[PDB]
Amino acid sequence: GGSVIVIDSKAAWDAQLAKGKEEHKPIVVDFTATWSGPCKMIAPLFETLSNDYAGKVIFLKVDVDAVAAVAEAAGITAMPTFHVYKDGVKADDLVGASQDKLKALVAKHA
């Protein structure tokens, strides 16, 4: 919900990366899995952050099992993994469900 945009395909991924270029907003992505306890724990915070930073940062969700080709291309091997994209390319990351480090990652780029 909120401002978290669910990515279902490479085409949708590419469209959102292009939108970030046009809007000059960083994109933060949660590469996540439904079966992962840490992922479930932090997904609500990812959503509230998406609302708090609406207008400054774009938030995407990629389920690594439903969009495996995108997650594989992005090198995801543990979940949650957060990436930041700027100008279409990877700029920063965080591996693991750390609420404090996720808040810090978003603030750094907003």
Author numbering: 1 to 110
Recite the paper's sentences.
In the present study, we deepen the structural features of CrTRXh1, providing the 3D structures of both the reduced form and variants in which catalytic cysteines were mutated. Regardless of the reducing activity in which TRXs are involved, the N-terminal active site Cys (CysN) is responsible for the first nucleophilic attack on oxidized targets. While the subsequent catalytic steps underlying TRX-dependent protein deglutathionylation and denitrosylation are yet undefined, the reduction of protein disulfides implies the formation of a mixed-disulfide bond between the CysN and a Cys on target protein.
